[PDB]
Amino acid sequence: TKNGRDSQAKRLGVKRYEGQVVRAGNILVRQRGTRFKPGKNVGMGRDFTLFALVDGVVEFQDRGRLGRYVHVRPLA
Amino acid sequence: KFRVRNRIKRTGRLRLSVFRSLKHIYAQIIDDEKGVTLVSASSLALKLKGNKTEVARQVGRALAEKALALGIKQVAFDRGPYKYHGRVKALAEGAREG
Amino acid sequence: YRLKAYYREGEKPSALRRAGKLPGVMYNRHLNRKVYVDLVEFDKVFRQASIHHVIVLELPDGQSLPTLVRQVNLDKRRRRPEHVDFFVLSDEPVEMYVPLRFVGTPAGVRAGGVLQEIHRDILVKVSPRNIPEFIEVDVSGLEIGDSLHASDLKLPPGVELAVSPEETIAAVVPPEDVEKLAEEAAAE
Amino acid sequence: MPRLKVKLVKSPIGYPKDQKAALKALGLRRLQQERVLEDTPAIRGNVEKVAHLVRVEVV
Amino acid sequence: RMKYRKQQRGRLKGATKGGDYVAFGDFGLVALEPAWITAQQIEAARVAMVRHFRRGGKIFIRIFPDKPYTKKPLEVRMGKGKGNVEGYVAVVKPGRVMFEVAGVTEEQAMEALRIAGHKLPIKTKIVRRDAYDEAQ
RNA sequence: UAGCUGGUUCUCCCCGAAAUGACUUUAGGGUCAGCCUCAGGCGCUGACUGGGGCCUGUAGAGCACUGAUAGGGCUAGGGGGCCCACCAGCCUACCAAACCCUGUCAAACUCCGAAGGGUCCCAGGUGGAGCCUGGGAGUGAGGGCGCGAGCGAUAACGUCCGCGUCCGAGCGCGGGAACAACCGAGACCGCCAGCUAAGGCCCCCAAGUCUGGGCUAAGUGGUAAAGGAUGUGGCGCCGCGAAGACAGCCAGGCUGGUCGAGUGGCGCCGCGCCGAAAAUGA
RNA sequence: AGAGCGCAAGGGUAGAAGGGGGCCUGACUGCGAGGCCUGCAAGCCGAGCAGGGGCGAAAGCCGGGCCUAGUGAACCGGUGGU
RNA sequence: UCCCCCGUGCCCAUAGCGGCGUGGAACCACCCGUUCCCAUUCCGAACACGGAAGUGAAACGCGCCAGCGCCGAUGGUACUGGGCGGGCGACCGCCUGGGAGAGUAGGUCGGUGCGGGGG
Ligand SMILES: [Mg+2]
Ligand SMILES: [Mg+2]
Ligand SMILES: [Mg+2]
Ligand SMILES: [Mg+2]
Ligand SMILES: [Mg+2]
Ligand SMILES: [Mg+2]
Ligand SMILES: [Mg+2]
Ligand SMILES: [Mg+2]
Ligand SMILES: [Mg+2]
Ligand SMILES: [Mg+2]
Ligand SMILES: [Mg+2]
Ligand SMILES: [Mg+2]
Ligand SMILES: [Mg+2]
Ligand SMILES: [Mg+2]
Ligand SMILES: [Mg+2]
Ligand SMILES: [Mg+2]
Ligand SMILES: [Mg+2]
Ligand SMILES: [Mg+2]
Ligand SMILES: [Mg+2]
Ligand SMILES: [Mg+2]
Ligand SMILES: [Mg+2]
Ligand SMILES: [Mg+2]
Ligand SMILES: [Mg+2]
Ligand SMILES: [Mg+2]
Ligand SMILES: [Mg+2]
Ligand SMILES: [Mg+2]
Ligand SMILES: [Mg+2]
Ligand SMILES: [Mg+2]
Ligand SMILES: [Mg+2]
Ligand SMILES: [Mg+2]
Ligand SMILES: [Mg+2]
Ligand SMILES: [Mg+2]
Ligand SMILES: [Mg+2]
Ligand SMILES: [Mg+2]
Ligand SMILES: [Mg+2]
Ligand SMILES: [Mg+2]
Ligand SMILES: [Mg+2]
Ligand SMILES: [Mg+2]
Ligand SMILES: [Mg+2]
Ligand SMILES: [Mg+2]
Ligand SMILES: [Mg+2]
Ligand SMILES: [Mg+2]
Ligand SMILES: [Mg+2]
Ligand SMILES: [Mg+2]
Ligand SMILES: [Mg+2]
Ligand SMILES: [Mg+2]
Ligand SMILES: [Mg+2]
Ligand SMILES: [Mg+2]
Ligand SMILES: [Mg+2]
Ligand SMILES: [Mg+2]
Ligand SMILES: [Mg+2]
Ligand SMILES: [Mg+2]
Ligand SMILES: [Mg+2]
Ligand SMILES: [Mg+2]
Ligand SMILES: [Mg+2]
Ligand SMILES: [Mg+2]
Ligand SMILES: [Mg+2]
Ligand SMILES: [Mg+2]
Ligand SMILES: [Mg+2]
């Protein structure tokens, strides 16, 4: 045939879940676009990687129209 | 439009929402992340005369004097739907004057 | 028509059916209650009954109820009724599929042709007093090639058609035979 | 939470790995073996999973 | 037709969606067993129908072969099947209503439909219309 | 030289695999990881479970997208007939875009969407649990069964993955006639004790020729289909019937009588019948 | 939002990542808390610190391009430098 | 406290689409004009400044209808962790805990913050 070809698995998804402590920089979610959005103490980078901006717990916001966000609710 | 507002809010704190009517020029200093305004140095529907630019500058010193007596200092400026240039301009401009 | 209802609570919906009682439910803007007619009976009732004529339903509450079958879930795999929706009427206008009796033999069917009958019934907004045991259809001037729509109905007094005013009701399609066993063979 | 008296009556040789761990969690080693435990949700949780293996009794 | 080339086999689960109610003509023919029915099978019945009752009513065929059916050519294992020898089939679960006639007598249809189920590779029952629908 | 084949010797005790991933002039060889074991650490963290949050796009469903599709409608385009170039007009059981309606299909479609699964928190869980650093490994041909898919032919004791399991290493014990992996059950030693498991309780063969209610007359059971049939029993509905029916018998072309009580057809369930030809003796 | 987003497909997307403008070269140097991913080697994301800059009034944004391909250990050697 | 307006966030269509109505005192819009600041690949359409008079027509604000849209049970089923049963097989069935989609009933022309002007 002319098939049987493919690209190695990219292991993407939500890396931290709601209610996990995390340090600064922790990748929070790896993603195909903005399947999720940044938000509170949560930056994002070239690939759309979301990541903690300060240690603290993670939470997930649904906002319909506006899309889904992820934040760290800091504390120490 | 209002793209700007999104860009500002991201920064963190202390938006100065400069609204401006054809005869007026209000101005809130809104602390988002709770949905409350801190100071509210309006203008035409407040007290001051009728000359616009000189009015804006005067209402600039409005929020100014009103602010420090509370704590504010982050110039964080909602250059609202109106492009910063004149009335809006002078506004924050006076808020800087003191 | 009339059929003896019963009340239902905890009983295993499935264990019921083995007994013979087709479970169901009566509900309307104010009412919603678990029940279960009897199957052998519901058959006979609903055979003629269906969802045109109303059925008043008797509970051991004596209460005669002014309802008709809103919908019935049939079980796939050899037809049978699963359970029954019973819309309690009151008096305010209510929508419902009222029949259609197509009367007369059209120009089509005569010169060979076929009774195509898109809607063997139609949905109309109406109050319970008007249970128009049917509607007439002047199907007779119809020809193979022609079709009577919705905007062409003998509407009884006080009744308003709920469907789109342009839906087709029936039509007259050609027969079908061997001028299409030769031609349908090689040509394709 | 009265006592639960679980006995093992059907052998686990051939049930899922978990189900064996279940019995290890409850503390059943051998067959036809008695074992009494507090009716907490956790004990229940496992005792349920091996339901087809044990015979429970309330004590 | 269209779409793309060849397609998995899949299984034939419970009779689920596979089934319903007469929905045009007077009488119906319904599937008891699950099956891939071939176009050459449909069409085989279709004709057997009319050819039986000439200048006849209207036969509605409500099953349709969108499944392309592969088949390697007497060799061994290299790649997917050339396929398509039996071309296409219709996935048909227990209870599906394949054909129904209209414009006919009870004994016209009780025949036509009878013959057809013969042409089919499956066990089938014939149907009326009782009342069973959805309305009020 | 031999990445190959063969052979490798006393005893008892504890634990106990793998036949997978990655790379490999690699594919029956290896290196690191995975799984086994030993020593020194740490100490409730371990599998499994309860509650709690988050994350998901399958089964199912659905047609809102991408496409597919049968019938009909309305409806541009085309082909054909009237008419003639003042080009338009009109018809059209012809093919048919878009559109609507009824009806549907899809691994690479989804407006939806389960059970479940993953993870973190709190809790139970002291187990041949768990983590950490080290010594020694073998394994890197697996197979079958169940479930979910691909391939295949919805063939193969086929093949290729996934979850699980057993054989592997439990060809130790019971059952299944016999039989690695189906059913039961994890064999430390001994007993001329007892309860059981699966499976059985007429004889070979241990234990009921046990009790009660049915069904079947084929040796069915003792294991083959589409389809066929006044098998048999059980239930449901329609047609004529004591105003005389069905069956025959007398007369005429349904009618009459006579007889005198049921008769004809459909439908569903149980058990059965046919379809049913192979080579050493059943 | 079915377009566009250089190119495949996909996920994302106008409350722009798309079209047009004005000024510009951060297609920076020195680094790098902390993670994703993973046998190894490799690949990936990245706040922030310093230096000196760019656009902006400013909050701020810039360590190339909506993202995910556009590649090659080590040896040996070429050129330029401290 | 209450009522209307103005700026602005939160819920994410039960806010919306479309239709009738209404408010100009205030507030806001449209509005007068293009000299100044400032502006268009052409235009004072848009941005911008200075501002009589006029207007609520457009816009927007508030209401009122349910045609579209959107939300949408309950009951039942599909499916299905776990546990099983029959049959010779594609498959079919029960126990147990979970349980849709679609469809009916139905709802819906919003809910609510903080601040400001006005009775
Ligand atoms: Mg591959
Ligand atoms: Mg960055
Ligand atoms: Mg980028
Ligand atoms: Mg960058
Ligand atoms: Mg708020
Ligand atoms: Mg015509
Ligand atoms: Mg309606
Ligand atoms: Mg077993
Ligand atoms: Mg324990
Ligand atoms: Mg057949
Ligand atoms: Mg051991
Ligand atoms: Mg080989
Ligand atoms: Mg070798
Ligand atoms: Mg843990
Ligand atoms: Mg549709
Ligand atoms: Mg047509
Ligand atoms: Mg047509
Ligand atoms: Mg001609
Ligand atoms: Mg179309
Ligand atoms: Mg839904
Ligand atoms: Mg669950
Ligand atoms: Mg769960
Ligand atoms: Mg201990
Ligand atoms: Mg190897
Ligand atoms: Mg096989
Ligand atoms: Mg085998
Ligand atoms: Mg073992
Ligand atoms: Mg004996
Ligand atoms: Mg006996
Ligand atoms: Mg006896
Ligand atoms: Mg018998
Ligand atoms: Mg037959
Ligand atoms: Mg048979
Ligand atoms: Mg018979
Ligand atoms: Mg029946
Ligand atoms: Mg530029
Ligand atoms: Mg690092
Ligand atoms: Mg790092
Ligand atoms: Mg940085
Ligand atoms: Mg700097
Ligand atoms: Mg400097
Ligand atoms: Mg940026
Ligand atoms: Mg760009
Ligand atoms: Mg070398
Ligand atoms: Mg070299
Ligand atoms: Mg060179
Ligand atoms: Mg108006
Ligand atoms: Mg008015
Ligand atoms: Mg006025
Ligand atoms: Mg000038
Ligand atoms: Mg108006
Ligand atoms: Mg109101
Ligand atoms: Mg909707
Ligand atoms: Mg809806
Ligand atoms: Mg629902
Ligand atoms: Mg629903
Ligand atoms: Mg508000
Ligand atoms: Mg509001
Ligand atoms: Mg007053």
From Swiss-Prot, chain A:
List where this protein forms a coiled coil.
Answer: none
MF terms in GO: structural constituent of ribosome
Superkingdom of the organism of origin? Bacteria
- Looking at the UniProt entry, the stretches that span the membrane are none
Mind telling me which GO cellular component terms the entry cites? cytosolic large ribosomal subunit
What keywords would UniProt list here?
Ribonucleoprotein, Ribosomal protein
A Pfam short name: Ribosomal_L27
The Gene Ontology biological process terms listed for this entry are: translation
Gene3D superfamilies referenced in this protein's UniProt entry, alphabetically: 2.40.50.100
The name this protein carries in UniProt is: Large ribosomal subunit protein bL27
Source organism per entry reads Thermus thermophilus (strain ATCC BAA-163 / DSM 7039 / HB27)
Native organism taxonomy: Bacteria, Thermotogati, Deinococcota, Deinococci, Thermales
Curated annotation (Swiss-Prot), chain B:
Note whether Glycoprotein occurs among the keywords.
Answer: no
Q: Does the keyword Ion transport feature in the UniProt annotation?
A: no
Q: Out of the domains of life, which is the source?
A: Bacteria
Instruction: Look up the record and give one Gene Ontology term from the biological process aspect.
Output: translation
GO molecular function terms noted in the UniProt entry: 5S rRNA binding; structural constituent of ribosome
Single GO cellular component term:
cytosolic large ribosomal subunit
Check the record and name the Gene3D superfamilies matching this protein: 3.30.420.100
Give the protein family.
Answer: Belongs to the universal ribosomal protein uL18 family.
Q: How does it assemble?
A: Part of the 50S ribosomal subunit; part of the 5S rRNA/L5/L18/L25 subcomplex. Contacts the 5S and 23S rRNAs.
Q: Which NCBIfam families match?
A: L18_bact
Its biological purpose is as follows:
This is one of the proteins that bind and probably mediate the attachment of the 5S RNA into the large ribosomal subunit, where it forms part of the central protuberance.
Instruction: Write the protein's name.
Output: Large ribosomal subunit protein uL18
Source species of the chain? Thermus thermophilus (strain ATCC BAA-163 / DSM 7039 / HB27)
Swiss-Prot record, chain C:
Point out the gene that encodes the protein. rplY
Q: What protein name is recorded for this chain?
A: Large ribosomal subunit protein bL25
Return the GO cellular component terms, semicolon-separated.
Answer: cytosolic large ribosomal subunit
Family to which the UniProt record says this protein belongs: Belongs to the bacterial ribosomal protein bL25 family. CTC subfamily.
- Keyword Ribosomal protein applies: yes
GO biological-process terms attached to the record: translation
- Keywords from the named record: Ribonucleoprotein, Ribosomal protein, RNA-binding, rRNA-binding
Role, per record = This is one of the proteins that binds to the 5S RNA in the ribosome where it forms part of the central protuberance.
Identify the domain of life: Bacteria
- Give the matching Pfam families: Ribosomal_L25p, Ribosomal_TL5_C
Provide the assembly information.
Part of the 50S ribosomal subunit; part of the 5S rRNA/L5/L18/L25 subcomplex. Contacts the 5S rRNA. Binds to the 5S rRNA independently of L5 and L18.
In its UniProt record, a GO molecular function of this protein is: 5S rRNA binding
UniProtKB/Swiss-Prot annotation, chain D:
Single GO biological process annotation from the record: translation
Entry keyword Transmembrane helix: no
Q: What's the source species for this entry? A: Thermus thermophilus (strain ATCC BAA-163 / DSM 7039 / HB27)
Keyword Ribonucleoprotein in record: yes
Which domain of life does the protein's organism represent? Bacteria
The GO terms describing molecular function are: structural constituent of ribosome
Q: Which UniProt keywords apply?
A: Ribonucleoprotein, Ribosomal protein
**Any one cellular component term from GO for this entry?**
cytosolic large ribosomal subunit
* Quaternary structure and interacting proteins, as annotated: Part of the 50S ribosomal subunit.
Give the protein's recorded name: Large ribosomal subunit protein uL30
Q: Spell out the NCBIfam families in the cross-references.
A: rpmD_bact
Report the PROSITE patterns cross-referenced here. RIBOSOMAL_L30 (PS00634)
The entry sums up its family as follows: Belongs to the universal ribosomal protein uL30 family.
Database matches in CDD domains? Ribosomal_L30
> Which N-terminal residues, if any, form the signal peptide?
none
